Design an enzyme around this catalytic site. Structure first.
Site, PDB file in Angstrom:
ATOM      1  N   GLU A  62       5.954  67.490  16.074  1.00  0.00           N
ATOM      2  CA  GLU A  62       6.958  68.391  16.629  1.00  0.00           C
ATOM      3  C   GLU A  62       7.253  69.508  15.638  1.00  0.00           C
ATOM      4  O   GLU A  62       7.632  69.224  14.494  1.00  0.00           O
ATOM      5  CB  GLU A  62       8.236  67.629  16.962  1.00  0.00           C
ATOM      6  CG  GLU A  62       9.383  68.511  17.434  1.00  0.00           C
ATOM      7  CD  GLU A  62       9.159  69.074  18.824  1.00  0.00           C
ATOM      8  OE1 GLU A  62       8.427  68.445  19.615  1.00  0.00           O
ATOM      9  OE2 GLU A  62       9.718  70.148  19.129  1.00  0.00           O
ATOM     10  N   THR A 136       5.815  59.661  17.325  1.00  0.00           N
ATOM     11  CA  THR A 136       5.235  60.102  16.062  1.00  0.00           C
ATOM     12  C   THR A 136       5.477  59.083  14.958  1.00  0.00           C
ATOM     13  O   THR A 136       4.585  58.815  14.147  1.00  0.00           O
ATOM     14  CB  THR A 136       5.808  61.464  15.673  1.00  0.00           C
ATOM     15  OG1 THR A 136       5.687  62.364  16.781  1.00  0.00           O
ATOM     16  CG2 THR A 136       5.054  62.041  14.486  1.00  0.00           C
ATOM     17  N   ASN A 219      22.151  59.610   7.575  1.00  0.00           N
ATOM     18  CA  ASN A 219      21.057  59.810   6.633  1.00  0.00           C
ATOM     19  C   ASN A 219      21.544  60.063   5.215  1.00  0.00           C
ATOM     20  O   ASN A 219      20.769  59.891   4.269  1.00  0.00           O
ATOM     21  CB  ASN A 219      20.179  60.974   7.094  1.00  0.00           C
ATOM     22  CG  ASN A 219      19.724  60.821   8.529  1.00  0.00           C
ATOM     23  OD1 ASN A 219      19.993  59.809   9.173  1.00  0.00           O
ATOM     24  ND2 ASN A 219      19.035  61.831   9.039  1.00  0.00           N
ATOM     25  N   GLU A 245       7.775  44.234  -8.782  1.00  0.00           N
ATOM     26  CA  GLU A 245       8.649  43.065  -8.754  1.00  0.00           C
ATOM     27  C   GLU A 245       9.143  42.757  -7.346  1.00  0.00           C
ATOM     28  O   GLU A 245       9.480  41.605  -7.053  1.00  0.00           O
ATOM     29  CB  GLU A 245       9.845  43.265  -9.685  1.00  0.00           C
ATOM     30  CG  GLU A 245       9.565  42.994 -11.153  1.00  0.00           C
ATOM     31  CD  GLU A 245      10.828  42.964 -11.991  1.00  0.00           C
ATOM     32  OE1 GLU A 245      11.929  42.894 -11.407  1.00  0.00           O
ATOM     33  OE2 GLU A 245      10.724  43.029 -13.234  1.00  0.00           O
TER      34      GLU A 245
HETATM   35  N1  LIG Z   1      19.595  57.200  11.565  1.00  0.00           N
HETATM   36  C1  LIG Z   1      18.930  58.217  12.102  1.00  0.00           C
HETATM   37  N2  LIG Z   1      18.035  57.988  13.126  1.00  0.00           N
HETATM   38  C2  LIG Z   1      17.355  59.018  13.680  1.00  0.00           C
HETATM   39  C3  LIG Z   1      17.548  60.310  13.225  1.00  0.00           C
HETATM   40  N3  LIG Z   1      16.752  61.126  13.945  1.00  0.00           N
HETATM   41  C4  LIG Z   1      16.062  60.383  14.837  1.00  0.00           C
HETATM   42  N4  LIG Z   1      16.436  59.077  14.691  1.00  0.00           N
HETATM   43  C5  LIG Z   1      15.918  57.926  15.447  1.00  0.00           C
HETATM   44  O1  LIG Z   1      14.685  58.268  16.039  1.00  0.00           O
HETATM   45  C6  LIG Z   1      14.565  57.694  17.318  1.00  0.00           C
HETATM   46  C7  LIG Z   1      13.873  58.683  18.244  1.00  0.00           C
HETATM   47  O2  LIG Z   1      12.507  58.776  17.918  1.00  0.00           O
HETATM   48  P1  LIG Z   1      11.972  59.829  16.827  1.00  0.00           P
HETATM   49  O3  LIG Z   1      11.508  59.120  15.580  1.00  0.00           O
HETATM   50  O4  LIG Z   1      13.070  60.813  16.506  1.00  0.00           O
HETATM   51  O5  LIG Z   1      10.780  60.598  17.583  1.00  0.00           O
HETATM   52  P2  LIG Z   1       9.427  61.061  16.849  1.00  0.00           P
HETATM   53  O6  LIG Z   1       8.843  59.979  15.977  1.00  0.00           O
HETATM   54  O7  LIG Z   1       9.660  62.332  16.073  1.00  0.00           O
HETATM   55  O8  LIG Z   1       8.446  61.381  18.075  1.00  0.00           O
HETATM   56  P3  LIG Z   1       8.670  62.743  18.894  1.00  0.00           P
HETATM   57  O9  LIG Z   1      10.137  62.919  19.192  1.00  0.00           O
HETATM   58  O10 LIG Z   1       7.881  62.692  20.177  1.00  0.00           O
HETATM   59  O11 LIG Z   1       8.184  63.891  18.047  1.00  0.00           O
HETATM   60  C8  LIG Z   1      15.972  57.393  17.792  1.00  0.00           C
HETATM   61  O12 LIG Z   1      16.050  56.067  18.256  1.00  0.00           O
HETATM   62  C9  LIG Z   1      16.861  57.564  16.581  1.00  0.00           C
HETATM   63  O13 LIG Z   1      17.527  56.359  16.296  1.00  0.00           O
HETATM   64  C10 LIG Z   1      18.444  60.547  12.196  1.00  0.00           C
HETATM   65  O14 LIG Z   1      18.625  61.689  11.786  1.00  0.00           O
HETATM   66  N5  LIG Z   1      19.136  59.497  11.637  1.00  0.00           N
HETATM   67  N1  LIG Z   2      19.211  36.975 -24.197  1.00  0.00           N
HETATM   68  C1  LIG Z   2      18.471  37.919 -23.566  1.00  0.00           C
HETATM   69  N2  LIG Z   2      17.828  37.581 -22.423  1.00  0.00           N
HETATM   70  C2  LIG Z   2      17.082  38.486 -21.753  1.00  0.00           C
HETATM   71  C3  LIG Z   2      16.962  39.841 -22.292  1.00  0.00           C
HETATM   72  N3  LIG Z   2      16.178  40.523 -21.439  1.00  0.00           N
HETATM   73  C4  LIG Z   2      15.810  39.670 -20.450  1.00  0.00           C
HETATM   74  N4  LIG Z   2      16.354  38.458 -20.640  1.00  0.00           N
HETATM   75  C5  LIG Z   2      16.176  37.266 -19.782  1.00  0.00           C
HETATM   76  O1  LIG Z   2      14.803  37.121 -19.418  1.00  0.00           O
HETATM   77  C6  LIG Z   2      14.716  36.521 -18.128  1.00  0.00           C
HETATM   78  C7  LIG Z   2      13.612  37.186 -17.329  1.00  0.00           C
HETATM   79  O2  LIG Z   2      12.907  38.085 -18.173  1.00  0.00           O
HETATM   80  P1  LIG Z   2      12.163  39.340 -17.504  1.00  0.00           P
HETATM   81  O3  LIG Z   2      13.125  40.488 -17.330  1.00  0.00           O
HETATM   82  O4  LIG Z   2      11.550  38.960 -16.179  1.00  0.00           O
HETATM   83  O5  LIG Z   2      11.020  39.716 -18.563  1.00  0.00           O
HETATM   84  P2  LIG Z   2       9.723  40.494 -18.031  1.00  0.00           P
HETATM   85  O6  LIG Z   2       8.757  39.491 -17.455  1.00  0.00           O
HETATM   86  O7  LIG Z   2       9.084  41.231 -19.177  1.00  0.00           O
HETATM   87  O8  LIG Z   2      10.119  41.472 -16.955  1.00  0.00           O
HETATM   88  C8  LIG Z   2      16.056  36.739 -17.454  1.00  0.00           C
HETATM   89  O9  LIG Z   2      16.602  35.474 -17.071  1.00  0.00           O
HETATM   90  C9  LIG Z   2      16.950  37.392 -18.485  1.00  0.00           C
HETATM   91  O10 LIG Z   2      18.193  36.693 -18.576  1.00  0.00           O
HETATM   92  C10 LIG Z   2      17.700  40.136 -23.539  1.00  0.00           C
HETATM   93  O11 LIG Z   2      17.661  41.270 -24.057  1.00  0.00           O
HETATM   94  N5  LIG Z   2      18.408  39.152 -24.099  1.00  0.00           N
HETATM   95 MG   LIG Z   3      10.158  64.543  17.845  1.00  0.00          MG
END
Ligand SMILES: Nc1nc2c(ncn2[C@@H]2O[C@H](COP(=O)(O)OP(=O)(O)OP(=O)(O)O)[C@@H](O)[C@H]2O)c(=O)[nH]1
Ligand SMILES: Nc1nc2c(ncn2[C@@H]2O[C@H](COP(=O)(O)OP(=O)(O)O)[C@@H](O)[C@H]2O)c(=O)[nH]1
Ligand SMILES: [Mg+2]
Ligand SMILES: Nc1nc2c(ncn2[C@@H]2O[C@H](COP(=O)(O)OP(=O)(O)OP(=O)(O)O)[C@@H](O)[C@H]2O)c(=O)[nH]1
Ligand SMILES: Nc1nc2c(ncn2[C@@H]2O[C@H](COP(=O)(O)OP(=O)(O)O)[C@@H](O)[C@H]2O)c(=O)[nH]1
Ligand SMILES: [Mg+2]
Lengths: 430, 45, 48, 427, 427, 430
Positions: A62, A136, A219, A245
């Protein structure tokens, strides 16, 4: 360097993306012209001398929603060839956006992604913004996500899909168009975050105490969810949670990867003075049923996994204390085989408020994204909603005439029926 | 005694450590020995 | 750097004071008197 | 002349070591710049153990940082005492493990483990004699756990007669910080038993308890935990760095605390932990340090030491104190509560004194304890792993990268083999 | 070297102990900030009886403050001399007993009796040779009655060879301050008969009568009554803390005052109390001290001693006194009214002297008496107990937590048992 | 820390709490905006930077009384979402406030109680302010009360209820509403303090010597009664008495928990200067029958138990002497099985005075709250009052259609009769 490509397909993708990059320029101090008056490398690329262009594509058939960006306040920000337009829209047809109108535009979409992939040193993930109700967002979204899996295998896709509401719909063929998109959503995407418009409606009505907001206000706070998800890459913090993660912590089984969303402080300007916003207070507010982004009741299901992205002045002591209080209460139910169900991520930058926005300046925020078994109610409701119209085969002559066969509806119903069976047997206690 | 960490670690040697052993200068006198002979020792070439 | 210089931003805009740790680890010049004991006391009721 | 090579892995190990080099460097008097500004002549006698003399009086640590994301390196590099490290010791990857034990150990581990073992070979050949290696990591993660214990297996194969200090935090009892804590902890302990020489067990909840009930810190920051952990890690190797009255190196603690080779998991706690306000109230004698070190809440482990007997305990006293007052006080804990000890090992408690205290302390001690009460922590890890492994939850990320479901079975078999040995010796 | 651990429970015991440490610390001359600022060397000779030497010259009391509500913690702390106690010894609860013996002794005391026994053991094991445990509480409340005697029950089997002194106030006959005084009393006295080694009975209304008839105060405030208790409590341990011509510690008093193991309830009173008008008229002499000590209205207990016979009396004199005048006046007061003493015990009264009186006084005396007359209060609270126990009023609170009416009969049996040989030995 | 949570249901609840929170702000120095220019913790939540918000809720189905608080001088004191409004009042219908229209608002009511309890650290009791004769105070009052017992078991609830007078009443079905509110108030409340309207009218006519007072003047001295009993949590005293101490000292039997409450010095401005106020005089005036705030004769019944909330410069001995003189007075009478009958609580702060209020400053004050068998004549009249109107089924169709059945009026009848049988059998001498 850590860096994420964002992709916006469909009208809902463009309008949310118009609010997402508005928040992103305010995080980094980038003015709308494109000049800063090293955290920007996640989303912006330093082009030449002082020019920053987004790592994004605005692909839409569109032309009225894509040239609104071209004639808005962000004409100088975006590179002009990233904004990919078309002649006619998909017009709410999955068969159109997948087969007859989307094929000649998806080759242009892959070229910009390839050029953005070569322009980025080490890519970390894809952000795909679409709504499955529109033609779309579903038809062209399926086509682009299918080719990205072939081109870039084993690389995580973090998508955000706006689903139809139980009560409120702005289209009639949304149940037809949501089911066919979901058959392409299981196989290719990695983590898909569930979004629903009506659950954003009552957050605005109750917490933000505004009676009649519009899609600009929806939005705006969706971007607060999106930014806090990816805030760990841009800014340093105590417990960093990157995109890699997210797939390991939140996806236990390959077909159960749909996750709800929540934002803890939803406070208006005048409400901030009276209300106290501590870590223990917002963690309880995050788990409230009224604060979710999808109109589902978590009490019916069980939380299979949880992920809390904190921001701002959050000491690690009280987030440890607040998680222990969540485990005690009987209302929040976990599945029996997952005793360790919390991942906590603490960043060290408070959320940025936009001028004229309804959010107030809050020192600390939580972005809760949790896998649950209550999400099967959302799929079952759309499954029952689609099964009502396929029984009499209403609104099928449009899809059949635009390329695809009628057998694609039976396979898409069978694929969602497997999703109904999956959420029942996984979530059941053993 | 010591009032700071630097002074404690500096006076560790001269008070309780490797330099704490009593020196003959610290000794008031050298005792006069009841040696066997002040003449030549018997088997000493 | 461009010429091989090992550049590193200090990232000390007085945020390192909040980043740092506060464990006493000091048996010399410990706070003696009234305010040292009164600081750790939670407020509680008031006395007339 | 006895050197220890430091290797920091993962987010936890790099952040612990940054505060660890905040303490050791300040103890030896070297400034943020790198030169020497200390006011003690005893500091510069033993700098060989933790540093290297460079050109112009500069001192560089024997530290090899290791991580799979450059983000945690930048926080260490930017922070104070972060410029002292060698830039060629900053080996790092790009993709990041993402809390997957398979990524750290099997698939992405091979692309960096060739670029780590050559760097640590360079440090080991440079020094004179290796007393051992010191590694700091986490077990709950996947970046510092899978790559960490892979590094132990390679460095034990190529240096087979050296000590291996592993300082590892375990998954917390009350809460969880990552969702795959039982999977990573079961796989890491399976590889840490047959490779690591002595293992030190830390837990965040015990750090959170000590920071609250003793120090009375209402908001314990994330570096208060590391400072208390670094207070032990500086105190383990006190006899190598300062003159002492009864010396105890890494191998004396290895031979006096390990009855049988598999039973090498300990727990630590720094002794004179007071609040700032209540320092005037409490007196400072050797019996008052001993009363604090045998308290169950002064441990930095999740286990409750009253629930099990102490097999072997070691105390590393520091400061000007009497050796009889040290020794008769460790007899009182053998007699006041003799039911809490192992009957068939006479003289369970070893005491050693090194008469140069840490920075700003009258007296201090580091208490290492080999208790059978730590079987509760491994049973907590074992029961969490059994809940998920039968349902095969969170396993397709691990088994999609070469580590199929067979290796989980011997991981849990050795997990239950360790808790069977602790429970048997409690009888 | 013999030394006293003080444990204060309840609103009454915390408040009268704050006044106790107000008076004793003034006697030994230490300031509100804990430093010593007196004049005599005899003050420092026995400081370890109540205080611990701290680094920097601080003197902390050997007091452990316990209560179930934080309100009484704030009143003691905010007052003068309320800072000297250790911040670790300020153990307290949150909910509060609420004048309920069942809540204090069973539910809310259970999760706090472990905390107080962690610190009572700590204070006892840190010091050399315990003389005994001195406690102050109330028998009418629930914080110092239920939780207070739970500690007395617990500490008895932990240290079964040490003294025990309970300075407990009993409910007054004329008035009532809590409506469940007979329930709180008879259940608490049931606990003290087998656990407390000796008990000192106090009452409110006799403190009021002394401040009116003798001291002539118009409005005796709430802190004045505690000072009369504190003057006696400092007088019991006069021979522990100062030299004397004839010393008497707290086991000499126990073996003399207790003829039979269940008769450990005593009545006390401070002798030299005169109004401000009568200071310039009264002559301080030992015959004057004798006729004030044995007066019925000078007892701080509610009982009238003329009704019953004294089994054993003690007089802990303090000051430079001729011992014959101490000795002869005891014989003189034993034979002018010989019926009011007991016939089958020769040499009823016990006299001890110390050469250091309280400040300003040239002579002072503390009277401890084991009278039959205290059966009047025990039969009174038994009379009030049987009145409401028949109707089972105010009882669903006590049995609502899981303490049935089975021991209520056992408590009423023991009160009827205790009054039985008081009347038996009267004959 | 010690805490208390107040709820206010119905028109009488809001207007009393309007006077109560006006009294509480002057004592702790809270400005109407909510910012002071340690003891405020019991009633106020210290929010953010120096702003204190009350630990209350103002819920009422009728919006016009809640909206007075919103547009009044305390618009900045209370949290905005804290005050709860409704569409339509129960309008003197216990069936409406408990079944039809009170069900949709009690679910929101428990949400704010849960948020206030989670912010609380040590909870000591609940304050319930309602009138049992009104539709909202009985209907919504019972529904909020019964859900609090299940949610927060074994927690004290100080329900201050205004009861209709034998001679004075303004709603015809107040006897119908009082009996139905009584059926739930026994098994749920822990301490209930009876209040009557025209006994306060008699106090203001005689003691205040003013001829024309309104309900503003009544609720001011009622607020002094609430602030007198709760002052020992906020301020120190010689004999501190807590909320938990009230229940075991004033409720002998599990069903007898109704207590009279009297305030001893209630003196006007020019009268108090000529008056000599001492403890002996106010203690005699406390037990004086015309000073009782419920139309009841204390001579008719026996004072089962009594507590005295002494305030101001009161030494512990003139209260000791005044109790003895009251004990020897032959006009009053205690029950035989309760010899120890007095609870004495002395506080060290004189009561505050509102500017523009009828009360003058006094050095000392007594709040005499006593359990008596004389309260049976209040419920004996209401039993006679209810039985006559129910004898020919008057005003029953207003209750039958909106949920309630006929049997609930029958079932509530013996519940008062079992209560009447309990009073006469507990005052009987044995
Ligand atoms: N939350 C939110 N939803 C939106 C917004 N604009 C469109 N929608 C959602 O989009 C749905 C309508 O389909 P669209 O995704 O807009 O249509 P399209 O994918 O562009 O396909 P065409 O209209 O044919 O070009 C509605 O159910 C709305 O909920 C928006 O600005 N905010
Ligand atoms: N005491 C202490 N614990 C930590 C620290 N950073 C991470 N942890 C612990 O490490 C655990 C998981 O480590 P993680 O963040 O996954 O290490 P990664 O694998 O390198 O991402 C968590 O339960 C944290 O509590 C720190 O600076 N001090
Ligand atoms: Mg449209
Ligand atoms: N003490 C006091 N009593 C009041 C006040 N306002 C109303 N009342 C009493 O309340 C009775 C009227 O019933 P309410 O409880 O107020 O009825 P309501 O609260 O409006 O409930 P709904 O009618 O259902 O909306 C009157 O008879 C008064 O006795 C007040 O401000 N102070
Ligand atoms: N002599 C004296 N008696 C007191 C004091 N405080 C309270 N009491 C008595 O103790 C009784 C009330 O006890 P209470 O405070 O409820 O005890 P608790 O529940 O253990 O704190 C009353 O009868 C008072 O007479 C005091 O400071 N001195
Ligand atoms: Mg109304």
């Amino acid at each position: 360097m850590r860096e994420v490509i964002s992709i916006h397909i469909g009208q809902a993708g463009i309008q949310v993306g118009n609010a997402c990059w508005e928040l992103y320029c305010l995080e980094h101090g980038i003015q709308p012209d494109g000049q800063m008056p090293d955290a920007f490398n996640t989303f912006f690329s330093e082009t030449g001398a002082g020019k920053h262009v987004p790592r994004c594509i605005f692909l839409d058939l569109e032309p009225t929603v894509v040239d609104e960006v071209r004639t808005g306040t962000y004409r100088q920000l975006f590179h002009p060839e990233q904004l990919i337009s078309g002649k006619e829209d998909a017009a709410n047809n999955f068969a159109r956006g997948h087969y007859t109108i989307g094929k000649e535009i998806v080759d242009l979409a892959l070229d910009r992604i390839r050029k953005l992939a070569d322009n980025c040193t080490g890519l970390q993930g894809f952000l795909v913004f679409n709504a499955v109700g529109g033609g779309t967002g579903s038809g062209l979204g399926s086509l682009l996500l299918e080719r990205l899996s072939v081109d870039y295998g084993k690389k995580s896709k973090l998508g955000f899909t706006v689903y139809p509401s139980p009560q409120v719909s702005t289209a009639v063929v949304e149940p037809y168009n949501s089911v066919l998109s979901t058959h392409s959503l299981l196989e290719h995407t990695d983590v898909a975050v569930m979004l629903d418009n009506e659950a954003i409606y009552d957050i605005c009505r109750r917490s933000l105490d505004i009676e009649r907001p519009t899609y600009t206000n929806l939005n705006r706070l969706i971007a607060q969810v999106i930014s806090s998800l990816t805030a760990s890459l841009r800014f340093d913090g105590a417990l960093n949670v990157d995109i890699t993660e997210f797939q390991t912590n939140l996806v236990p089984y390959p077909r159960i990867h749909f996750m709800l969303s929540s934002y803890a402080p939803i406070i208006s300007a005048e409400k901030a003075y009276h209300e106290q916003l501590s870590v223990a207070e917002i963690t309880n507010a995050a788990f409230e049923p009224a604060s979710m982004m999808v109109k589902c009741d978590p009490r019916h299901g069980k939380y299979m996994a949880c992920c809390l992205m904190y921001r701002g002045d959050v000491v690690p002591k009280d987030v440890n204390a607040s998680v222990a209080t969540i485990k005690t209460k009987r209302t929040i139910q976990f599945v029996d085989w997952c005793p360790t169900g919390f991942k906590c991520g603490i960043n060290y930058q408070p959320p940025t408020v936009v001028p004229g926005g309804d959010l107030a300046k809050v020192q600390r925020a939580v972005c809760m994204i949790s896998n649950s078994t209550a999400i099967g109610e959302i799929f079952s409701r759309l499954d029952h909603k689609f099964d009502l119209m396929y029984a009499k085969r209403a609104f099928v002559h449009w899809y059949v005439g635009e390329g695809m066969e009628e057998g694609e509806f039976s396979e898409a119903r069978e694929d969602l029926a497997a999703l109904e069976k999956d959420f029942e047997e996984v979530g059941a206690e053993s | 005694g010591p009032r700071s960490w630097a002074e404690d670690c500096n006076q560790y040697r001269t008070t309780r450590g490797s330099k704490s052993y009593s020196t003959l200068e610290d000794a008031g006198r050298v005792p006069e020995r009841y040696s066997r002979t002040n003449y030549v020792p018997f088997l000493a070439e | 750097d461009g010429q091989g210089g090992y550049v590193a931003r200090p990232l000390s805009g007085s945020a390192v004071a909040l980043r740092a740790s506060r464990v006493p680890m000091d048996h010399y010049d410990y706070p003696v008197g009234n305010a040292a004991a009164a600081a750790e006391v939670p407020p509680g009721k008031r006395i007339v | 002349m006895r050197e220890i090579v430091h290797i920091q892995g993962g987010q936890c190990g790099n952040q612990i070591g940054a505060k660890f080099w905040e303490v050791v460097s300040d103890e030896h008097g070297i400034d943020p710049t790198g030169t020497y500004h200390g006011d003690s002549d005893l500091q510069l006698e033993r700098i060989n153990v933790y540093f290297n003399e460079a050109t112009g009086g500069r001192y560089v640590p024997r530290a090899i940082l290791m991580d799979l994301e450059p983000g945690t390196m930048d926080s260490v590099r930017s922070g104070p005492y972060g410029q002292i490290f060698r830039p060629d010791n900053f080996v790092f990857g790009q993709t990041g493990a993402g809390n997957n034990w398979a990524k750290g150990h099997y698939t992405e581990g091979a692309e960096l483990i060739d670029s780590v073992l050559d760097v640590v070979r360079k440090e080991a050949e440079s020094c004179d004699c290796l007393q051992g290696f010191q590694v700091c990591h986490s077990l709950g993660g996947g970046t510092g756990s899978g790559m960490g214990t892979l590094l132990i297996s390679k460095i034990r194969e190529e240096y087979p007669d050296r000590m291996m200090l592993t300082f590892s935090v375990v998954p917390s009892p009350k809460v969880s910080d990552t969702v795959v804590e039982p999977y990573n902890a079961t796989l890491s302990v399976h590889q840490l038993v047959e490779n690591a020489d002595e293992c030190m067990v830390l837990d965040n909840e015990a750090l959170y308890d000590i920071c609250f009930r003793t120090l009375k810190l209402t908001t314990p920051t994330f570096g208060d935990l590391n400072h208390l952990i670094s207070a032990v890690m500086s105190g383990i190797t006190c006899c190598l760095r300062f003159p002492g009255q009864l010396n105890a190196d890494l191998r004396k603690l290895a031979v006096n605390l390990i009855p049988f080779p598999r039973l090498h998991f300990f727990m630590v706690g720094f002794t004179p932990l007071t609040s700032r306000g209540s320092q005037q109230y409490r007196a400072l004698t050797v019996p008052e340090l001993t009363q604090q070190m045998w308290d169950a809440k002064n441990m930095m482990c999740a286990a409750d030491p009253r629930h099990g007997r102490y097999l072997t305990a070691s105390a590393l006293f520091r400061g000007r104190m009497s050796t009889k007052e040290v020794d008769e006080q460790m007899l009182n804990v053998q007699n006041k509560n003799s039911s809490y000890f192992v009957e068939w090992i006479p003289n369970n408690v070893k005491s050693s004194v090194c008469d140069i205290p840490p920075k700003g302390l009258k007296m201090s001690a580091t208490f290492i304890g080999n208790s059978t009460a730590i079987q509760e922590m491994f049973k907590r890890v074992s029961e969490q792993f059994t809940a998920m492994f039968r349902r095969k939850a969170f396993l397709h990320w691990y088994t999609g990268e070469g580590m199929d479901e067979m290796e989980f079975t011997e991981a849990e078999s050795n997990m239950n083999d360790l808790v069977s040995e602790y429970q048997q010796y409690q009888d």
